[model samples]
Target: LRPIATPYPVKEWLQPKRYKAHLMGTTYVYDFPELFRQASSSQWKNFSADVKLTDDFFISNELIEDENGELTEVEREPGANAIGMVAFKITVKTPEYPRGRQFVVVANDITFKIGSFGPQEDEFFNKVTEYARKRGIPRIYLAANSGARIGMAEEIVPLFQVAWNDAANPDKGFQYLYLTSEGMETLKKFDKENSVLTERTVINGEERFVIKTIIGSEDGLGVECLRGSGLIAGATSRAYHDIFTITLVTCRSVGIGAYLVRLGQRAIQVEGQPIILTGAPAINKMLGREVYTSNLQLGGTQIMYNNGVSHLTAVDDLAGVEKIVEWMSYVPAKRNMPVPILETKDTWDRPVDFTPTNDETYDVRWMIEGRETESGFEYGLFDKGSFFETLSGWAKGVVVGRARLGGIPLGVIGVETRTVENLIPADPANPNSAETLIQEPGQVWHPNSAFKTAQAINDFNNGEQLPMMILANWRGFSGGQRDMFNEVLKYGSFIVDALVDYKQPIIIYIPPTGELRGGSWVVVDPTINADQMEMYADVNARAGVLEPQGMVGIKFRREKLLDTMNRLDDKYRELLPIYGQISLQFADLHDRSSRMVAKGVISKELEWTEARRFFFWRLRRRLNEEYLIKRLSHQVGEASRLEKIARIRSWYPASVDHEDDRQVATWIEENYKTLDDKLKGLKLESFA
Candidate 1:
């Protein structure tokens, strides 16, 4: 067998590379301090200033001391004895917050004890996270660590003697190692727990102490380090719940380091970084074989990103920070605050330039995010250049991201309009297997896409606290035997559950040439969240229990078709040839947007060209009204709260359309005293 506990050589790409070094035509690796400085924003204030120490803050290691009980001051390798972390408050400028948006950053100093977590490091990490949570700022973790600190009793190593079963053939095995009396006397100067002596024996007329186990006696070393890790992990998990938490794995993250990343939920992995619970060498030893060649094979971007553990991947540290800043642009500067809004040149009145066709197989992003052209970029319903996609590497059938509409930030969900190939990577443990591809049909909710949708909605609602816009275009959930076996129904129900708990405004719009049928309509219907959500259908959009063709076959059968033809055309025998065509057209009328509005299934029907301007005002008004409602002095039960909303709507003048939420909201704000009196007396006069 190969040498036990020997690690495989690191992959070349895992080595750190300098940021923005291409202009020099040469590349260099960043040291730990430089890596932290460059990976954070361009302008940041270091909270942990330049204070250095030569000894562990929480533990006493006598090996590093002198005979007189003073620090030995040995010349160690550069960057080796410094604390393994630093805290910073970074500022990233965006159109919404030009002065700067700030967040707390805690980065591991990889040069110090290989970034292992000792008592002091873990305590520092927890403190930083708690500070961010209390300040309502986002917490950013830059993980580049080995694992918990593991120390050995180094003073005993050189003095101990191994007792061989066969003196000439040491490979056969050895009896218990022992220490001489002089060696024991020297070790006594250190902590008494460093060695566990079992029995004494006479060897060549000399007394020897048999050593059963050797332990590291330092307070922050050995198992105590794991206790510190648990503290940090719990803090990180709570921070994720109370505030926004994200982690970027810049290098190898093992054991509890990986747990911290996973607990943070939103992770971005730098290219070639591995997030693993155990090293490949350790697992290989457990299995009694070299099953893996490198840690990258276990948890690299190829594995984590594809499996949806890492929401994004970056080419380098600079690119990683850029993505982080872009994501933060959509979120509020702090929790419980309004989402940031920017002044944009992309006007809300302009007609959306991209329109889908019934039979075209195209990328939905072009319609949701707009595409570039030689003349200029055509603007979609959202603001230009504002869509920042997440989890793009997984769930190809659905697109989820953060985008802006007229400079207002919101969460967006668009359906992919073409068939998507979901790639499942091959199992590394079974070399005989190969990667497999499953084709997920467009306009259908697969199990994976359903779960992705629910996850996105919950993330936006709980952490980002942003409004949502769903460009709904789904036929139905895939109910095939395979999909059902994968619990498609359970995942499909999750979308409704997310909407039910959503506190921000939600707009579900069926885009032009889009369709929502059967279960898909039920999942996103406005009734799921009537107070906060509203539904709209484009003029040419279709929504119903089924598509027109399927409806015609089931509802407008042969008898119904003949009856309709005879009644409408009045030439029964002569029109029989065209009866099938007329019946399909008649059945399709039930799926029209106008029919949906009349049936009260949708709030309104809109022309595709006017949707952008319409939704912007609608959302602006809703936000204003919601804010106004919160400002009301009298708070009550849910029904009373809803009653006040109706009274506020009734106060709108006849000149303002009640459907125009912006106009009505402005009128109510201007006449707040009058409306407040009406609300107090439980009496209101309608001007509409």
Candidate 2:
């Protein structure tokens, strides 16, 4: 191997396996109970601390010995009297809320019955979700289970004789299966419900009990657990719509456990854990071949994370919880509440440090979050170190994340400016096929990136309710035959649809040296959602229906170019060579931000350095204005549309920085009588 520089001593590189293992991970396992503690900020408390069940339905009773050889009781179980699951109401301290914010966390404990979902466990899960929904807080699910509980009738297993088609010569067949009379009497003693079907029969001159089938029981076992699974699944689905729901899989998640993760939508899986609907052994059995050796082969991070089922992956349980807390920082503490804001030491009015050249290719994340420099870290457009990217594993051409601008949280979508090489795996059915690398160019939207954009927008709009700032830099959506066949147009339209339905404020800005062209411009035009959406452009930015060359090729034909060249140039045919070069310059003049502003396609044009402060005040003012409108409308019982807007607009001062909403409210209250006297005189005519 060639010699290379190493962070550690160069001798360490000689042990390649050890080096790789150290970089990947070490041997450390965090079980559910320990993970639960690691996930909390401090002192995790039980959700329903007072609730307990002592009935025979629960496996934990005075007679059952615990793992430590001590007697176990139902009340001693971790969660709502459920043996294999636990729920805790934890307070996680984040940058946005250093005092701590509350969330309901429900997790499965694999140490207990392999963390399978019994009836009691499902009931507790439903209760915990309901608790979070009622309080309007976020819910975090740590899923690590073997699926719904599976059990057989232990009472009947040893007593019932398996009837074979062949008897003692053993190739000869037997007629029917039977249970001895004594075993039948023993089953009736314990199972008072007569759950089994049986009849009296005589076999070999001996009185026998013929067995038919066993029916359902509510013993926290069998098909009853599936009913519980369905109930929790429905509850989880509802929680997704009502509040923020996120799941973390710290271990293998099977069957219904996998469904819960999918239902919650935002999932973080730990390294090596699998989220599968079925175990590998069962799948291999069904296929009549040993196709899969481990559960990871079916649903590991490689499969789930790439497919976008898992938005993020963590190295351990603590890291997964840290990601969950980071995600919550971008959202409000509760639905319908003001977004949580952090108090940053970084100044709001500082000029941004990074500037992109027109043809440069760079990671957009560095521009949003800032980069480390010799003098520590430089500040970006948003607050320093506030950007946390999600869905980074998929859709390489589009970037989505949450970042703070002057301490205010918002969603960000930036265009990736480098060619992305996507690896497509070969078909498993075809042995001759090999993996292919598909090169996706920058500044163009493909089917996956467009869908990702729409998904991020809807997620921000629906539960998070944070305002959005889209760094508009796309040239156009990909229109190639392969892309179109993959429904690129359909997903491209979904971006427009998501923006139209957005309830929060949206600001689409073309970054410095960036271009927004053709179909990309149409989808984000302010007119689509005029009241809630606004568009802006940097002075150096370019926006138009098409690029200059494409437009010149069609509109400024060879005949038109020659006529213009002959009329303007005194040398006429003598300067024909240079005129051909100057012909392309005319079309670009119309694509400038100046032309875009004059045409009223964008709200305003500003320099890239001024973007940080410009957006800070704009977003703050818009949020204040919207809140005031809601408050005033609620106070005055619903005024006419024209009257309501006029009244709200009147509250703001005629000029500059008077956007403090509380000042307006206090002023109106103090001058109520004086304003009432002035208004009473003006109420005379039909000016009402």
Q: Specify the highest-TM-score model's number.
A: 2
Local distance difference test values of all predictions, in order: 0.76, 0.75
Q: What lDDT would candidate 1 get against the real structure? A: 0.76
Once superposed on the true structure, which residue ranges of model 2 sit more than 4 Å away at CA?
Answer: 1-81, 92-95, 98-100, 161-183, 198-212, 216-222, 374-377, 427-432, 565-581, 633-636, 639-643, 653-688
> How many times do residue backbones clash in model 1?
0
Question: Please, what are the lDDT tens digits per residue for candidate 2 over residues 604-669?
Answer: 998888788888878877776566555555542356645755775674457523445345444555
lDDT of 1 at 351: 88
RMSD of each: 9.7, 10.1
Let me know the TM-score candidate 2 reaches against the reference structure: 0.81
Tell me the deviation in Å of residue 298 in model 1: 2.5
For residues 498-594, write the lDDT of model 1, one tens digit per residue: 9999989999999988999999999999989888899999999988898878888888888887777667764456665677777778878888998
